[PDB]
DNA sequence: GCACAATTTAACACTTTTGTCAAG
DNA sequence: CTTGACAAAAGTGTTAAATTGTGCTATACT
């Protein structure tokens, strides 16, 4: 998405989109949990071994 | 030290490329937006949803329990609202997220221009507040130019920032400032007079006089005018100016106290209270009531003839041939006796 | 620094109370 | 000690003038 309508990327038909050459990458010692419908977690608040995310 | 302090604090964070600017002010404005679409799903204020949302993101209990011994009910008015907005479909859901993590950005652009906005105060010392001080005042203007900017028009944050922060600062000097109180317009047109008397004498050479320095000024200014208004100007004397060539004195302990009886004054009333008196004593038994109604004498007001006439019974025509008589009758007394003669000043 | 809403003040038209006079 | 009649003084109400309280602007400037 772009400022003007215009230089916004259109999808010309099907396929597969891919990130590259990064102004910067910032690693984070973290542990990623990919979800697919919803959550129920909220950003900011404390976890613990067990709890549902 | 406080000084360097904040200057190290705000030292401790880098400034931002263009490229985060604009990405900034983007998702901090599709928060600002996303919280005014939650208005429009579970029906809630729009400043409502924004402030819960500082309350599970700018902190816990903590954000409500000190705005004053009142803002708004943390367990009641809120808690409901934290609730309320949480069960609600993946189409609504996404758009707290979007509110808690644009209104974040918000303070990532504050803190960012910081930097700036302590470097704008930097040329305004004098005003009578301290950098830091003076600093703060300023660093709230930035929150307004925050909150209010367009990342569409093109334009660098640092425009439109500078003018909320000059903004804020030159408002807090003309609501601070001097000792006693002066209304915004009035200080400002202070600053004009002087402005224009430094200038005219820098032109002319020769300090100017009260019709021409109100005569460079414009319409309806006279010599009187500008005078008028810098008696107000110039501000109170500390009482703490030591007087004299030595070291122990001071400026205070030569006032003196009027707001308070002198012994002589008290003892003075006294005698007045009390040769009135015995000098009352003399007189018919209803003119001198009707004489100590007439002065307050007995309840410390004054009651006109309409009242001292329904006291007696007489009329408000009666009562008043009965002073003429009254005051008239002690002045033989006076004009022998000669106690009262005195207490005229 | 300025356009202006906000609120204060002096402005003033006018009603009512209160001091007052000649006569009972 | 008493009326009635009046003018001055003190009220009471609505206005015009002024005085004071506020939000804000956009090249860029960290």
Do not use: C
């Not at chain 2, 030159?170 to 202070?190: C, F, G, L, S, W």
């Not at chain 2, 009187?224 to 501000?235: C, D, F, G, N, S």
Request: net charge negative; proline share 5%.
């Amino acid at each position: 998405a772009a400022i003007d309508p215009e230089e916004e990327v259109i999808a010309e038909a099907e396929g597969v989109v891919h990130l590259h050459e990064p102004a910067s990458i910032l690693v984070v010692k973290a542990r990623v949990y990919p979800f697919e419908d919803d959550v129920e977690v909220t950003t900011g608040d404390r976890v613990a071994p067990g709890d549902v995310l | 030290d406080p000084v360097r302090q904040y200057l190290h604090e705000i030292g401790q964070v880098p400034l931002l490329t263009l490229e985060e600017e604009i990405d900034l002010a983007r998702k901090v404005e599709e928060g600002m937006e996303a919280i005014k679409k939650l208005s429009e799903a579970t029906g809630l204020d729009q400043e409502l949803i924004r402030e819960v949302v500082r309350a599970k993101i700018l902190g816990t209990a903590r954000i409500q329990k000190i705005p004053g011994l009142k803002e708004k009910p943390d367990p009641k008015t809120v808690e409901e609202v934290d609730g309320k907005l949480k069960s609600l479909p993946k189409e609504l859901k996404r758009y707290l997220h979007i509110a808690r993590e644009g209104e974040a950005a918000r303070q990532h652009l504050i803190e960012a221009n910081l930097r700036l906005v302590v470097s704008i105060a930097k040329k305004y010392t004098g005003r009578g507040l301290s950098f830091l001080d003076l600093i703060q005042e300023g660093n709230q203007g930035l929150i307004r130019a925050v909150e209010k900017f367009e990342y569409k028009r093109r334009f660098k944050f640092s425009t439109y920032a500078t003018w909320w922060i000059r903004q804020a600062i030159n408002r807090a000097i003309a609501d601070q400032a001097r000792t006693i109180r002066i209304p915004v317009h009035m200080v400002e047109t202070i600053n004009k007079l002087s402005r224009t008397a430094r200038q005219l004498q820098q032109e002319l050479g020769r300090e100017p006089s009260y019709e021409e320095i109100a005569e460079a000024m414009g319409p309806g200014w006279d010599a009187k005018r500008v005078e008028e208004t810098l008696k107000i100007a110039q501000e109170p004397v500390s009482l703490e100016t030591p007087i004299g060539d030595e070291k122990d004195s001071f400026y205070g302990d030569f006032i003196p106290d009027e707001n308070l009886p002198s012994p002589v004054e008290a003892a003075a009333q006294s005698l007045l209270s009390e040769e009135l008196e015995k000098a009352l004593s003399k007189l018919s038994e209803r003119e001198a009531m009707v004489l100590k109604l007439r002065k307050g004498l007995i309840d410390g007001r004054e009651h006109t003839l309409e009242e001292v006439g329904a006291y007696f019974g007489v009329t408000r025509e009666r009562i008043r041939q009965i002073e003429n008589k009254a005051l008239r009758k002690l002045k033989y007394h006076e004009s022998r006796t000669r106690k009262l003669r005195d207490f005229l000043e």
